[PDB]
A = this chain, B = another copy of it.
Amino acid sequence: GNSGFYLYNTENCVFADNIKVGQMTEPLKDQQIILGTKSTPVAAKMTASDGISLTVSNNSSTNASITIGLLKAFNNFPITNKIQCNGLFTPSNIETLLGGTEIGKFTVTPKSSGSMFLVSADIIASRMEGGVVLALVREGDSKPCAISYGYSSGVPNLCSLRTSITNTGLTPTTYSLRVGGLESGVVWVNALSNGNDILGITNTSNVSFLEVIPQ
């Protein structure tokens, strides 16, 4: 179109189709902002990394926007089923896929390169006096990537797994949690020793993944 100067209300403005200032070699192009340097301006792109979300809405002649937010880092997986875990964890099945009983499956997608997932499993469990084993398995692996231990005296108790896992890409990954007795015994999740409801209601165990940037 045209270019020049014009009065807008009381403001004396320059106008043109586009602009090239300083060290720029072409006019402002897609997603570039005019950025000052020690000398003359450059055309710079704004970009997000490490858990930052950058949303450029570039398709409005009038109502364009750039929003800076946090990438969605948190994934919660409630587990409310009562599950009888008859699968034992033994010295011969611990480094296989066969130990314990799967009590949940969780699919997550990293949003940042070189990130970790902070994983918390907090599982309400009951067994006749003895040990509980919890194991986290990555689908495609041939053995658990994290292993933890809890305890029940007969009455329900919280049994926990805390770990961090290194993320190798930006695609969906499926994890499963398996629970079973240490070397022997039957373990109930979200129930009493006999499979009955704890305090006669539905109870809730939790698994969560918090994506964090590691040092």
Residues on A lying within 8 angstroms of B by beta carbon are: 1-5, 7-8, 10-38, 40-54, 56-76, 89-91, 94-95, 108-109, 111, 116, 118, 120, 122, 124, 129-131, 133, 146-153, 155-164, 182-183, 198-201, 203-204, 206, 208, 210, 212-215
* Contacting pair A153 B153 (CB below 8 A): yes
CB within 8 A of A158: which of B60, B64, B150, B182? B150
Report the Cα distance A188→B83, complex, angstroms: 31
> Can you list 27 pairs linking A and B with CB atoms under 8 Å apart?
A11-B16, A12-B18, A13-B20, A16-B21, A16-B22, A17-B21, A18-B21, A18-B40, A19-B21, A24-B62, A28-B34, A28-B36, A28-B40, A29-B36, A29-B38, A30-B37, A35-B64, A44-B58, A48-B69, A49-B68, A51-B69, A68-B68, A74-B164, A74-B215, A124-B148, A149-B155, A151-B155
Main secondary structure on A side of the interface with B: strand
Q: Ordered nearest first, which 4 A-B pairs have the shortest CB separation?
A: A50-B69, A28-B36, A44-B64, A91-B200
A58 touching B72 in the complex, CB below 8 Å, given contacts A12-B3, A18-B22, A182-B156 = no
CB within 8 A of A42: which of B21, B35, B42, B58? B58
Name the distance in Å between A199's Cβ and chain B's nearest Cβ: 4
